[PDB]
Ligand code: NA
Ligand code: NA
Ligand code: NA
Ligand code: NA
Ligand code: NA
Ligand code: NA
Ligand code: NA
Ligand code: NA
Ligand code: NA
Ligand code: NA
Ligand code: NA
Ligand code: NA
Ligand code: NA
Ligand code: NA
């Protein structure tokens with residue numbers, strides 16, 4: 001196979017440090033599909049990025065066809081088929097992800113315009129940098145010649161967290177869990193939805209049989225997990241964010257299993273009462289590098305309220321970046 | 329059935345880079361589960377809890393479970409692969425660590441255990457561990473020279489323009505130290521003898537060997553931090569090849585106990601060209617050692633013997 005050209009921003013950062021070795025080892029497309037890494041950093045981090053590339057070379061990875069590094073997004077994104085926009089300022093303890101809306105926003109205006117100018121026709125664009133949904137909205141709107149559906153923000157770390165907590169509660173293997181959904185924003189208002197999930201062919205909410213645990217423990221544990229990692233580790237998630245980035249990109253490009261769906265924050269067409277044009281997390285299936293929102297789910301009153309709270313937040317964020325002039 | 333894998337220094341930088349790859353399938357592939365048993369010192373256990381939170385958040389299908397602790401006799405119980413990564417960042421300080429860890433392994437590891445030592449000074453730590461485990465066959469102990477090996481492959485690929493897949497039969501001889509000897513005279517670049525391809529002895533001595541030997545310091549100069557991800561990667565490569573076997577047209581480097589082969593003093597843990605099958609290594613037989621290579625091999629094994637003498641004088645053997 002021709003090498004897949006993959007761009008990674010913030011590539012000398014902590015997420016990048018985890019992610020690049022998984023990419024080069026075969027985690028994205030498997031053991032027979034080479035990858036070319038195109039790595040972006042800010043100028044003061046280029047010496048460190050040179051060091052990371054030395055380490056990549058020193059792994060003697062058979063799949064790594066080559067590496068280009070630089071600080072010019074038009075050079076690094078030239079011809080790329082997958083762009084992993086990870087680099088942005090991190091949050092720290094006591095911060096909400098939305099605290100970084102104005103700071104990180106302008107990065108995404110510029111990167112969307114660069115992608116628009118130079119990326120491969122088949123590009124798919126994943127955004128991990130915070131606040132992720134709004135940053136993906138910024139990038140998507142600044143790339144009018146790339147189809148809107150090519151942009152996604154990462155809610156897969158939230159999704160995976162929710163799988164982990166459900167498996168723990170139920171005594172199940174992670175492989176038993178299917179049809180998890182995270183709705184809305186990658187924030188504290190995210191809604192992890194058990195009511196459509198399955199634990200080995202059984203409805204998840206019925207298996208747990210405990211609405212109070214769902215409301216008082218499960219939802220806030222998942223929603224606030226990032227802050228819990230900051231408290232435990234002293235720094236934001238890195239390896240697990242990199243792992244979720246690989247999972248989301250892999251499923252996007254190679255497809256979801258027939259019996260399952262995943263969570264991706266993508267542009268709303270109004271489905272499920274989610275305001276049109278927001279980047280919001282939905283249950284989706286994928287095939288051929290394309291996603292489709294899962295149709296037909298009955299949204300119960302409790303779920304409805306939690307979804308709307310989260311989409312309300314997204315609408316507020318969208319208004320703020322529109323007022324800052326970052327959109328279009 | 330999950331392979332029980334112990335990792336020491338598990339909240340360190342190598343560990344951070346290693347554990348997620350292990351759990352994702354890098355060691356045994358996509359259908360073989362693993363159980364992680366993570367050792368740290370007591371003051372690092374809080375941090376290790378945070379690493380386990382992130383492991384759990386990955387929802388890894390292969391990760392059957394995780395146990396953490398500071399007692400090697402608990403963590404190593406029933407393990408079939410022990411990756412001894414943690415060490416004091418010299419010979420004496422690490423001596424107590426590896427004496428204690430070899431004794432623990434001897435007491436509680438699985439019969440089929442293989443023990444890979446990444447923590448420095450790796451060869452002599454491995455020797456100490458092996459000596460302290462008289463009920464585990466000596467061939468189960470290896471020190472990691474795979475990072476040097478892969479670094480050599482990297483330099484040789486850059487010099488020749490070949491793909492890394494075109495590079496075979498690289499060897500690192502001796503100690504994992506500045507006296508290591510990376511041997512191009514038996515390596516092949518797309519079938520052709522590597523030293524004949526390069527055709528430049530001054531480049532070998534003045535550039536290739538010192539660049540390999542000093543690479544860790546070059547990474548630190550560049551990144552401001554040590555080479556954790558590539559060390560992790562080498563650790564996985566070496567353990568994977570040990571357990572699953574080497575390719576039929578290739579060999580790898582492993583530091584293992586010497587039977588005298590190639591003039592390496594018996595009983596030293598020393599890096600040899602090896603093939604693997606069934607979880608067992610065999611030193612590559614039949615290689616002709618030229619005068620230049622003999623001199624460099626003997627300089628390294630002299631250092632290994634000096635280190636063995638030092639730890640013997642300290643009472644660690
Ligand atoms: Na960075
Ligand atoms: Na990292
Ligand atoms: Na691949
Ligand atoms: Na490697
Ligand atoms: Na390596
Ligand atoms: Na470059
Ligand atoms: Na667009
Ligand atoms: Na709640
Ligand atoms: Na949080
Ligand atoms: Na939490
Ligand atoms: Na938590
Ligand atoms: Na609407
Ligand atoms: Na909009
Ligand atoms: Na609102």
Ligand code: NA
Pocket residue numbers: 336337338367368369414
């Ligand atoms: Na340790």
Ligand code: NA
Pocket residue numbers: 337340341342343556
């Ligand atoms: Na380390």
Ligand code: NA
Pocket residue numbers: 349350351352353354355356357362
């Ligand atoms: Na594995």
Ligand code: NA
Pocket residue numbers: 380381384385
């Ligand atoms: Na956990």
Ligand code: NA
Pocket residue numbers: 156157160161240241243244245385386387
């Ligand atoms: Na994850």
Ligand code: NA
Pocket residue numbers: 466467468469470583584585
């Ligand atoms: Na041995």
Ligand code: NA
Pocket residue numbers: 443444445446470471472473566
């Ligand atoms: Na080893």
Ligand code: NA
Pocket residue numbers: 609610611612
């Ligand atoms: Na042998």
